[PDB]
UniProtKB/TrEMBL annotation:
<dbReference type="GO" id="GO:0005829">
    <property type="term" value="C:cytosol"/>
</dbReference>
<keyword id="KW-0808">Transferase</keyword>
<dbReference type="GO" id="GO:0046872">
    <property type="term" value="F:metal ion binding"/>
</dbReference>
<dbReference type="InterPro" id="IPR012893">
    <property type="entry name" value="HipA-like_C"/>
</dbReference>
<dbReference type="GO" id="GO:0004674">
    <property type="term" value="F:protein serine/threonine kinase activity"/>
</dbReference>
<keyword id="KW-0479">Metal-binding</keyword>
<feature type="modified residue" description="Phosphoserine">
    <location>
        <position position="62"/>
    </location>
</feature>
<dbReference type="InterPro" id="IPR052028">
    <property type="entry name" value="HipA_Ser/Thr_kinase"/>
</dbReference>
<protein>
    <recommendedName>
        <fullName>HipA-like C-terminal domain-containing protein</fullName>
    </recommendedName>
</protein>
<keyword id="KW-0418">Kinase</keyword>
<feature type="binding site">
    <location>
        <position position="227"/>
    </location>
    <ligand>
        <name>Mg(2+)</name>
    </ligand>
</feature>
<feature type="disulfide bond">
    <location>
        <begin position="12"/>
        <end position="80"/>
    </location>
</feature>
<comment type="similarity">
    <text>Belongs to the HipA Ser/Thr kinase family.</text>
</comment>
<dbReference type="Pfam" id="PF07804">
    <property type="entry name" value="HipA_C"/>
</dbReference>
<feature type="binding site">
    <location>
        <position position="210"/>
    </location>
    <ligand>
        <name>Mg(2+)</name>
    </ligand>
</feature>
<feature type="domain" description="HipA-like C-terminal">
    <location>
        <begin position="61"/>
        <end position="285"/>
    </location>
</feature>
């Protein structure tokens, strides 16, 4: 119980809960993938081999972006992922050959998002042949018996071409929600939480194609979250804070920019709702700090994350 001459307390690469030396994952985490999943075998490819497969398969896959990714199915009885080109059930993101600790960063950041009540798909880390960690996330547009749900990103919805990521604004993002979502006021609360979250965790890369609407449960809503990571600590010499301007600003954002201009003037949220969300963030910060300390980020990357988080929290008076 003192962890002085024995392994430090181990944490699950899916849930971050305490696990024993003989376990690689917690039962709770494995069962988020499937109630019958017994284990998750390491990927039989090194990080470099995963990146090469990503390059070879990109044109055959139904998901695309800047970073290296693979599509995969979960073989439940065999207890492993299988790489596929079509009908992916999961996306796998191997280590970058450029940026440090990208899978570990995205994994913990997506977990922080879940803890503040954002809708986040099942996600986690899986070991590789070279002991490197690869990030995985469930496809939220393929459910049940390989049934596809309709999904469109905000570039498509705002009449831009498929490459437009930055030539937009948070005000245009709001306008898309107002135009298309079934219950825009509910989605505005979600966008408020997501935008504060991205500021607190250093995600300066929440671009237009990271916003999507989905048709599910007999309504059109903002999709489950994807691609949330602390991009500031993974990059060097980052100066901007927001990918898309708010009030014409991508840097030097103020508390009133978020809590008055954005929350009240642009989103129309009632003051009691704003205060309640602020209190939610205030209460969650110690849990986030604990989770970062339990994460698979290196000690040095944890310190960068915690330092930035505390700076951003001070700017919003969330302490
Ligand atoms: N869990 C998920 N379920 C369904 N679709 C997903 C998904 N995650 C990502 N996608 C789809 O794949 C696209 C690219 O995803 P993502 O943004 O994570 O790529 P990426 O890792 O290459 C980083 P970047 O955004 O900088 O290109 C998304 O816009 C979305 O259409
Ligand atoms: Mg990005
Ligand atoms: Mg992004």
């Amino acid at each position: 119980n003192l962890y002085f001459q024995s392994n430090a307390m181990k944490h699950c690469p899916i849930t971050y809960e305490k696990i024993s030396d003989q376990e690689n994952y917690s039962q709770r985490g494995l069962h988020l993938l499937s109630p019958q999943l017994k284990n998750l075998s390491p990927l039989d490819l090194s990080a470099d081999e995963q990146r090469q497969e990503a390059i070879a398969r990109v044109g055959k896959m139904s998901v695309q972006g800047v970073q290296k990714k693979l599509s995969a199915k979960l073989k439940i009885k065999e207890g492993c992922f299988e790489i596929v080109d079509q009908y992916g059930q999961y996306i796998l993101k191997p280590q970058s050959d450029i940026y440090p600790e990208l899978p570990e960063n995205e994994a913990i950041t997506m977990t922080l998002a879940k803890t503040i009540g954002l809708e986040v798909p099942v996600h986690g880390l899986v070991y590789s042949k070279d002991n490197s960690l690869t990030y995985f996330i469930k496809r939220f547009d393929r459910i049940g018996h390989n049934k596809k749900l309709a999904l469109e990103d905000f570039a498509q919805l705002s009449g831009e071409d498929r490459h437009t990521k930055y030539k937009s604004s948070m005000e245009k993002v709001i306008a898309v929600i107002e135009q298309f979502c079934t219950f825009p006021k509910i989605e505005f609360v979600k966008l408020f939480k997501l935008t504060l979250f991205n500021f607190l965790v250093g995600n300066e890369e929440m671009h237009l194609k990271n916003f999507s609407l989905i048709t599910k449960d007999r309504k059109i809503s903002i999709s489950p979250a994807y691609d949330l990571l602390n991009s500031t600590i993974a990059q060097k010499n980052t100066k901007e804070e927001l990918a898309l301007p708010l009030k014409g600003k991508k840097n030097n954002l103020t508390k009133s920019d978020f809590l008055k201009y954005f929350a009240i003037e642009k989103l129309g949220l009632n003051q009691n709702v704003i205060d309640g969300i602020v209190q939610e963030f205030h209460q969650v910060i110690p849990k986030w700090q604990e989770l970062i300390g339990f994460s698979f980020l290196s000690q040095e990357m944890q310190e960068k994350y915690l330092e930035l988080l505390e700076q951003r929290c001070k700017r919003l008076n969330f302490f």
